[PDB]
Design a protein around this ligand. Structure first.
Ligand SMILES: [K+]
Ligand SMILES: [K+]
Ligand SMILES: [K+]
Ligand SMILES: [K+]
Ligand SMILES: [Mg+2]
Ligand SMILES: [Mg+2]
Ligand SMILES: [Mg+2]
Ligand SMILES: [Mg+2]
Ligand SMILES: [Mg+2]
Ligand SMILES: [Mg+2]
Ligand SMILES: [Mg+2]
Ligand SMILES: [Mg+2]
Ligand SMILES: [Mg+2]
Ligand SMILES: [Mg+2]
Ligand SMILES: [Mg+2]
Ligand SMILES: [Mg+2]
Ligand SMILES: [Mg+2]
Ligand SMILES: [Mg+2]
Ligand SMILES: [Mg+2]
Ligand SMILES: [Mg+2]
Ligand SMILES: [Mg+2]
Ligand SMILES: [Mg+2]
Ligand SMILES: [Mg+2]
Ligand SMILES: [Mg+2]
Ligand SMILES: [Mg+2]
Ligand SMILES: [Mg+2]
Ligand SMILES: [Mg+2]
Ligand SMILES: [Mg+2]
Ligand SMILES: [Mg+2]
Ligand SMILES: [Mg+2]
Ligand SMILES: [Mg+2]
Ligand SMILES: [Mg+2]
Ligand SMILES: [Mg+2]
Ligand SMILES: [Mg+2]
Ligand SMILES: [Mg+2]
Ligand SMILES: [Mg+2]
Ligand SMILES: [Mg+2]
Ligand SMILES: [Mg+2]
Ligand SMILES: [Mg+2]
Ligand SMILES: [Mg+2]
Ligand SMILES: [Mg+2]
Ligand SMILES: [Mg+2]
Ligand SMILES: [Mg+2]
Ligand SMILES: [Mg+2]
Ligand SMILES: [Mg+2]
Ligand SMILES: [Mg+2]
Ligand SMILES: [Mg+2]
Ligand SMILES: [Mg+2]
Ligand SMILES: [Mg+2]
Ligand SMILES: [Mg+2]
Ligand SMILES: [Mg+2]
Ligand SMILES: [Mg+2]
Ligand SMILES: [Mg+2]
Ligand SMILES: [Mg+2]
Ligand SMILES: [Mg+2]
Ligand code: NA
Ligand code: NA
Ligand code: NA
Ligand code: NA
Ligand SMILES: [Zn+2]
Lengths: 255, 81, 50, 47, 72, 55
RNA sequence: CGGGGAAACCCAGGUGGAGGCCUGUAGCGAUGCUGACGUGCAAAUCGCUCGUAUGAUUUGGGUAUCGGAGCGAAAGACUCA
RNA sequence: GCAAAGAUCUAACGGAGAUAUACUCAACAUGCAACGUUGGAUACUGGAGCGGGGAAGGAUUUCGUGCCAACGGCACUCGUACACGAGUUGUUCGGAAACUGAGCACAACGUUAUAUCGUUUUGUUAGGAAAGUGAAGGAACUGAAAAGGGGCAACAGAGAACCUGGGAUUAUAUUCCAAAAAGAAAUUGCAUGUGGG
RNA sequence: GUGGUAAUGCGGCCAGGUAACAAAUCAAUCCUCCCACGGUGAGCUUUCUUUUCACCAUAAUCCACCUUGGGCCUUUUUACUCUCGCGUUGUUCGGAGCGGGGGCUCAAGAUUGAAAAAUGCAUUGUGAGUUCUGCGCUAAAGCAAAAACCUGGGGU
RNA sequence: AAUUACCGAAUCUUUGAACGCAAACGGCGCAUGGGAGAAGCUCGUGUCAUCCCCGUGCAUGCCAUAUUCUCAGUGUCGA
RNA sequence: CCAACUGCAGACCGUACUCAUCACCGCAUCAGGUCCCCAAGCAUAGAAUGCUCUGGUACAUAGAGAAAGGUACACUCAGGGAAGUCGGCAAAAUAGAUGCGUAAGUUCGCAAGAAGCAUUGGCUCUGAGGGCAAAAAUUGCCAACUCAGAACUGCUUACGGCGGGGAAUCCAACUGUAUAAUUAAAACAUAGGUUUGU
């Protein structure tokens, strides 16, 4: 046979990110001495849109702590942030929308976004538009904090990790039907070469395990083992169950 | 259609002259020669084409210096008094 | 067209100078074997492509 | 070319235009100053 | 090209060392004096014929004088 | 009859930087002359409104 | 902007110029005549007729991905007849 | 068989290409057919042109004189054929000097029996000591500052100081023109006065 | 360095700006075509034709300084009191300052001259077209970057 | 000897491992030594700014070396 | 040090010609293919189509000339009108603009140019639609076109260009893609729906 498309995508080539129009990575400030001991105050200068991203980005200007110059930061903007607003980041920052505080200083039951999984990572959780995390509890003896993630799972992180107060802007995006093939074309133009999609049963046996036959059909079960080699692991990978879900929907993911 | 009509669609050129070997074998996009592998330091040489080796070996050119040094060796590096 | 590297222009110049017939007094030499240039080139028959 | 003209024929050139011929040689049109006569210089050379 | 609107300024230009020559143009309505310096060509315009003749004279002989005529 | 013109410089494409105008010469001929690009002028900072400055 | 109504609202006339909208050049294609030709104008062309023609549109130059491999709105299509 | 794209006619010059005869004989019935140039006539292309200029590609096919063996599937006194001799002129036009983009891959490091392999723009090489001169200080020296090596990739993106006239060629011209430069300008480098400080 | 109440006029390092960017509608510049009124040449002329055709040009670079389209200043501001007013073909604007009087400034034009007649060939008034320019700047699509240059904040 | 044969003295353009930096560019540098110079300065001479021309050195890695060159280390000591 | 002035000097490469029914690719001077700029007059909605001033061209083997049979970007036919044929293939037919009028069905947007009826030339007139200056609800000057109405007088229905229509069944929702050189479709894609891993 020949190589399957899912395996071919791993070489890179014509399947990489279209990033020419993007403004750069979005991240928090660097966890420095001022952030660890006091606070820093910056000003929001502009709010902008980036190709391929549903949330708005904010440019925030700070003063350099050691030299005579200005520093510009690009961050994911929570809903309600406006130009001219003051942003406080550090240990002694007050509790308000847009500020960045250590998790140990945030009251239980609060809504946060742009959460650091590890201290100094500059934000890796709850970044897509309309998403957020919920603080559950603190453990002062262990120095840890419990969080509920957008997926519904629960995670424990060190209390030194930082977070921003509020929810990510741009929520409600997926409620509007697309209605046209051209709209999907423009939607994926800013992201990558992954559209349109061709069904596996519409291909030939040389290219896909589902191809061939005098009827369009899969001749074997479409649930495949976790141990299947690349080129064979297509379909429903290591599925615990199939079919329409009756009753409550369980939380997805590993134990 | 393939054939006569498509022959008129061929524009530009893949290869140009090579600075090192002089053949029309220098790939413009990749910036390397298909005949002598310039700008690699060493040249192409393959034993599956001995006929091609005989076309490029020593003695197929001028040998401006080799002729002189061959004479000096044969005369044991003679010098005057 | 108008554009060409100077090295390319010099190669074309040499080919122009070589496109000449044999001088007549060559045929009168002792032991001569040459009658025509036998390497004459015409722009419509064979292309140089450089 | 301006300097060589002064050193060889003791004339002053006010303008030099050059071109490379299709046969590979280089040709120069050299205009002499009004103090000299090109025809007189040509006779001395031997044209 | 530059224009001068004073006889006193015109004499200064004519007295300059760079003035190669002066050209006199006779029009039906007026007379023009054009001085050729190194960079610019200065023009003085007069409307009285009697003043033009006086200005035509009293010019330094070092500066060349040219009468502008149609050439064939 | 009506005259037609040609590009007189070495660039023969109609881009924003190669705009031409039609001029009639004292010799009664119609030629093309290149018109220069223009600047937008001095503005206030982009984050403050980006407006032209008087004077 | 005119008329009606207690109120919620209803009826009529203009302005404006939206749409993977319609007729139709250039362009991009190729339905039928199972037309011409079928040792040809041509190792796939010609004539009339026909699809679409502001968009998932057409096109120049540059640049990236290949032979147990590449690419593919998927025909085992295409990768210098 | 040499049938798509409508089409030629006439007179005079030119040319060996004619009005070319054994008897008879006024001429026809015994030298046909075909060619270049100029002047007339008649048509076609019909500005999305068998118009005037460029890129890719070609490289002397351009121009003058001559010539008609072969070639221009008929013809030629003609030719993009053959022979000889000529022609391309820039401070300002295009490129480079001197930008960055999709991108490339020298150094460095690592890997491979094997470098002819990999990394090399998400501000950016390399376990990584990659900055070589501002001022100075008494006329060459000497050393403070500033993180992230050296390059290439656009003749349609960015950038770019010049215009007309000519009786000025056989062929080049926003490139040639000479003291009345036909002339009128703009701009770069270095020096000399004048004025101000 | 210095004027004006003001908009603004004239003689190492750090921060901004130009370069620098999609449409449509309306009005358009150079230019092209047409008409009218006059000059010059040519054509037709059995008959008619105050007639038919052609031409009547102004380069770059510099002086001086009325139109209409934006931005702003000052002064009147019981301006929207009880159907408030200004404005576009058009989807709107105003106590966060409309309209009126008087001004400052920017952009595109117009006019006067130098060039320039010494050149070229043998004229100055209206309608139609025309992307320079102005009208400030669909989308789950929101429209490259840098060199080079300009101005300012400090300091000397 | 424009004869030939052989060889000890010489010349030897642009490139190429190609090595100052690049390259569909007969392109562009730093240091040093020269050359020419219708400007200006000076008494036809001398001198010469900007521009122009020529020779030499300048890749990376490794070995040896410095009349004993200049440095770095919360490495080990010492005063 | 700064401003005009002035003096001197402004280096390198390209530059002929072509860009195509003869200069490039297709074995060739091949009815195939090949990117950009300028684009006149009349008819007309017009870059449709037809003819024309400027510029260009008369180059494509020709002469004589009513055989049969052919090809055509060529026509016409009495009476009947699909009886032909697998099949209305091919041909014929409709046709611009303006007024009136228009069914079932429907996701209320359409269906729809549904279907169908009527007018149209030439000439001589009348009315309406504006700009600028001085109950100015008035006086003078002037430009460019369009629409409507009337009388008279004609047709041989007369360039070019330009939808035939209706009643139903099967399939796919729709625009789109696709076997270069025998298959353009009911195949692929699509918005929408569901599932899996993290
Ligand atoms: K795709
Ligand atoms: K199957
Ligand atoms: K199938
Ligand atoms: K130490
Ligand atoms: Mg990437
Ligand atoms: Mg299939
Ligand atoms: Mg299989
Ligand atoms: Mg199925
Ligand atoms: Mg299986
Ligand atoms: Mg070439
Ligand atoms: Mg030159
Ligand atoms: Mg349509
Ligand atoms: Mg057939
Ligand atoms: Mg199959
Ligand atoms: Mg025959
Ligand atoms: Mg025939
Ligand atoms: Mg035939
Ligand atoms: Mg024919
Ligand atoms: Mg005869
Ligand atoms: Mg004739
Ligand atoms: Mg044409
Ligand atoms: Mg022949
Ligand atoms: Mg020849
Ligand atoms: Mg010759
Ligand atoms: Mg990377
Ligand atoms: Mg890059
Ligand atoms: Mg780098
Ligand atoms: Mg450019
Ligand atoms: Mg230039
Ligand atoms: Mg010519
Ligand atoms: Mg009010
Ligand atoms: Mg080198
Ligand atoms: Mg030329
Ligand atoms: Mg052309
Ligand atoms: Mg032909
Ligand atoms: Mg052809
Ligand atoms: Mg009309
Ligand atoms: Mg047409
Ligand atoms: Mg037309
Ligand atoms: Mg033929
Ligand atoms: Mg013919
Ligand atoms: Mg017949
Ligand atoms: Mg009949
Ligand atoms: Mg009937
Ligand atoms: Mg039957
Ligand atoms: Mg039919
Ligand atoms: Mg109904
Ligand atoms: Mg109807
Ligand atoms: Mg119906
Ligand atoms: Mg369908
Ligand atoms: Mg469509
Ligand atoms: Mg379709
Ligand atoms: Mg097929
Ligand atoms: Mg399907
Ligand atoms: Mg469904
Ligand atoms: Na980017
Ligand atoms: Na419309
Ligand atoms: Na036309
Ligand atoms: Na789907
Ligand atoms: Zn080579």
């Amino acid at each position: 046979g020949k190589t399957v498309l899912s395996c071919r995508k791993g070489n890179g080539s014509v399947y990489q990110v279209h990033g020419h129009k993007r403004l750069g990575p979005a991240k928090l400030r660097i966890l420095d001495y001022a952030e660890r001991h006091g606070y820093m105050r910056g000003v929001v200068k502009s709010i902008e849109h980036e190709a391929g991203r549903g949330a708005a980005l904010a440019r925030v200007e700070f003063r350099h702590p050691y030299k005579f110059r200005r520093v510009k930061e690009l961050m994911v903007a929570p809903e309600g942030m406006f130009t001219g607003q003051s942003v406080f980041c550090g240990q002694k920052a007050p509790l308000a929308i847009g500020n960045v505080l250590p998790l140990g200083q945030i009251t239980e039951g609060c809504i946060v976004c742009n959460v650091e999984a590890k201290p100094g990572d500059r934000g890796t959780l709850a970044r897509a538009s309309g998403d957020y995390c919920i603080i559950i509890s603190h453990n002062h003896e262990t120095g840890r904090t419990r969080l509920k993630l957008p997926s519904g799972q629960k995670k424990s992180v060190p209390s030194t990790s930082r977070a921003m107060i509020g929810i990510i802007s741009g929520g409600g995006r997926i409620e509007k039907p697309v209605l046209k093939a051209g709209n999907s074309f423009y939607r994926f133009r800013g992201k990558r070469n992954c559209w349109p999609k061709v069904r596996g049963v519409a291909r030939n046996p040389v290219e896909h395990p589902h191809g061939g036959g005098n009827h369009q059909h899969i001749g074997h079960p479409s649930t495949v083992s976790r141990h299947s080699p690349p080129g064979q692991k297509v379909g429903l990978i290591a599925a615990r169950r199939t079919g329409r879900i009756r009753g409550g929907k369980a939380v997805k993911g590993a134990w | 259609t393939k054939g006569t009509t498509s022959m008129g669609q061929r524009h530009g050129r893949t290869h140009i002259l090579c600075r090192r070997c002089g053949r029309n074998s220098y790939h413009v996009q990749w910036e390397r020669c298909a005949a002598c592998a310039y700008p690699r330091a060493s040249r192409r040489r393959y034993n599956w084409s001995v006929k091609a080796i005989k076309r490029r070996r020593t003695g197929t050119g001028r040998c401006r210096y080799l002729k002189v040094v061959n004479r000096r060796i044969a005369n044991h590096f003679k010098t005057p008094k | 067209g108008r554009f060409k590297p100077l090295a390319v222009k010099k190669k074309y110049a040499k080919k122009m100078n070589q496109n000449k017939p044999v001088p007549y007094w060559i045929r009168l030499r002792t032991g001569n074997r040459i009658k025509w240039n036998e390497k004459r080139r015409h722009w419509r028959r064979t292309k140089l492509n450089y | 070319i301006k300097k060589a003209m002064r050193k060889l024929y003791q004339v002053k050139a006010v303008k030099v235009n050059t071109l490379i011929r299709p046969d590979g040689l280089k040709k120069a049109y050299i205009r002499l100053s009004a103090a000299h006569d090109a025809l007189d210089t040509a006779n001395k050379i031997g044209l | 090209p530059r224009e001068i609107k004073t006889l006193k300024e015109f004499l200064a230009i004519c007295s300059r060392k760079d003035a190669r020559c002066v050209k006199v143009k006779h029009n039906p309505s007026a007379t023009k004096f054009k001085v050729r310096c190194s960079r610019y060509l200065y023009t003085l315009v007069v409307n009285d014929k009697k003043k033009a003749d006086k200005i035509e004279r009293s010019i330094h002989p070092s500066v060349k004088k040219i009468a502008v005529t149609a050439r064939s | 009859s009506c005259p037609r013109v040609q590009y007189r410089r070495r660039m023969h494409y109609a881009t924003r930087g190669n705009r031409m105008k039609m001029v009639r010469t004292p010799g009664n001929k119609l030629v093309m002359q290149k018109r220069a690009k223009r600047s937008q002028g001095i503005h206030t900072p982009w984050v403050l409104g980006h407006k032209r400055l008087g004077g």
